Write a protein that binds this ligand. Structure first.
Ligand code: NAG
Lengths: 396, 99
């Protein structure tokens, strides 16, 4: 059961007469679905991603400044000028400088001065944005039958099934092996706000940073840096990384305002990360809405022999899961497929079985089946698996 | 670590005392059992307040008591005052607890 691997979980319960359950599935959540006379199911939103989402605006984090050129004129001669002022990839400022005799100039007054600095971006100091397309984004929903098999989070359940929901994907049927069929219809517009969302990406090779951040579209367009679109040759607003020092005769002081990477990372502290599996850009938060069809699921092995009540041992003793459920695993020593004789008793009242199983009709197979999950009332209880027993105290 | 929590429960018929239930003076009861299967197994130990068979009242001081291919028969436990029955599967012994 995948939803034991997570400390966020939900439990959904249908009666014997149920069909088409409606869910919100969230990234890093998981839902266990239960219905009377049906096998229970773990259903989760595995991922939301796109292959190669469209590059939007690039920003420059650190300017590389060069070719500072100055021209200046005496107070009568009007504007000083440079061809730079008209070239691509330059920053310029025009100002008034005090002039006089000995400033190698005819008259005491203010002379026009112009300075221009050539201003490319520093190597690998780009913050690129990407935008999702509702016509190419994939939601992934995963399902597993809630069998008596325990498999770790670094391991895969053989009954695990996967459905991709693109916009071109209609109501999809997954054959849960011997457990029948489940059907899913997840509406890709009944999910994340893809217009409001940018995947912000820096250097992918940065060993001590996130691969990307999930950032708001308006905030990204409000980043106060030089910027350009994909394939554009030169930075808009290159001024934002250059300061000019107050004019001195025939000088105005070009200052590179330094690397703004740490300014960005402070404004990205605690912000949701996004993973980048090569070409796949993954959200790590967000959700989808689905209808799940239970109406073609089957109970496995309801016609199997009850197991020999003597032949059980624990593999894993009754344990609190943190979800108010108790989990355990048993071995069985007959060479058989059989129904596990599981029950639990409120201590001192042996007649009323109080085991609400989460694994319905628990069964041991020729390989697999020993794991059981159940819910119990507060106070002292005894769990039984035939002749095995374990006194269990239930909190709250 | 708890030893042998994955061992078979012992055959409830195959017990005898080596040493009958005895007051230790520490409010605990002590005893030792033999077991006649050729096995390592978990001892099926419990105790009952006399006339109320449903509630097991054995607070063991030896947790998960186990018989091994050599060793393991000794059990220590604590019990409520008055009449009790100690069981080790099909072995039993009526025990009266002081105070
Ligand atoms: C999962 O991790 C455990 C502990 O390291 C290891 O024994 C087991 O083989 C791993 N399973 C897989 C399929 O990687």
């Amino acid at each position: 059961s995948r939803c034991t691997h997570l400390e966020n979980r939900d439990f959904v319960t249908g009666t014997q007469g149920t069909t088409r359950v409606t869910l919100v599935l969230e990234l890093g959540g998981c839902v266990t679905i239960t219905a009377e006379g049906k096998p229970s199911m773990d259903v989760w939103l595995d991922s939301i991603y796109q292959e190669n989402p469209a590059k939007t605006r690039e920003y420059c984090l650190h300017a590389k400044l060069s070719d500072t050129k100055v021209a200046a004129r005496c107070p009568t001669m009007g504007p000083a000028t440079l061809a730079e002022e008209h070239q691509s990839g330059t920053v310029c400022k025009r100002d008034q400088s005090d002039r006089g005799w000995g400033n190698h100039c005819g008259l005491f007054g203010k002379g026009s001065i112009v300075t221009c600095v050539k201003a490319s971006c520093e190597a690998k100091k780009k913050a690129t944005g990407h935008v999702y397309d509702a016509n190419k984004i994939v939601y992934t929903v995963k399902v597993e039958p809630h069998t008596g098999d325990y498999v770790a989070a670094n391991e895969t359940h053989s009954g695990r099934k996967t459905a991709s929901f693109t916009v071109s994907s209609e109501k999809t049927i997954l054959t849960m092996g011997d457990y029948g069929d489940v059907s899913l219809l997840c509406r890709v517009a009944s999910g994340v706000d893809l217009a409001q969302t940018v995947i912000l990406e820096l250097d992918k090779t940065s060993e001590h940073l996130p691969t990307a951040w999930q950032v708001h579209r308006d905030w990204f367009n409000d980043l106060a840096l030089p910027w350009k679109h994909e394939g554009a040759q030169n930075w808009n607003n290159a001024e934002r990384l250059v300061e000019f020092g107050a004019p001195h005769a025939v000088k105005m002081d070009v200052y590179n305002l330094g690397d703004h990477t740490g300014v960005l990372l402070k404004s990205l502290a605690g912000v949701p990360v996004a993973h980048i599996d090569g070409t796949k850009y993954h959200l790590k938060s967000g959700h989808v809405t689905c209808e799940v069809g239970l109406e073609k699921l089957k109970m496995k092995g309801l016609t199997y022999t009850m197991c020999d009540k003597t032949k059980f041992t624990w593999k894993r003793i009754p344990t609190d899961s943190g979800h108010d459920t108790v989990v355990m695993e048993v071995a069985f020593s007959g060479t058989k497929p059989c129904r596990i004789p599981v029950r639990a008793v409120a201590h001192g009242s042996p007649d009323v079985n109080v085991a609400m199983l989460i694994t319905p009709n628990p069964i041991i197979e020729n390989n697999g089946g020993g794991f059981i999950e159940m819910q119990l009332p507060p106070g002292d209880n005894i769990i039984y698996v035939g002749e095995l027993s374990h006194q269990w105290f239930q909190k709250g």
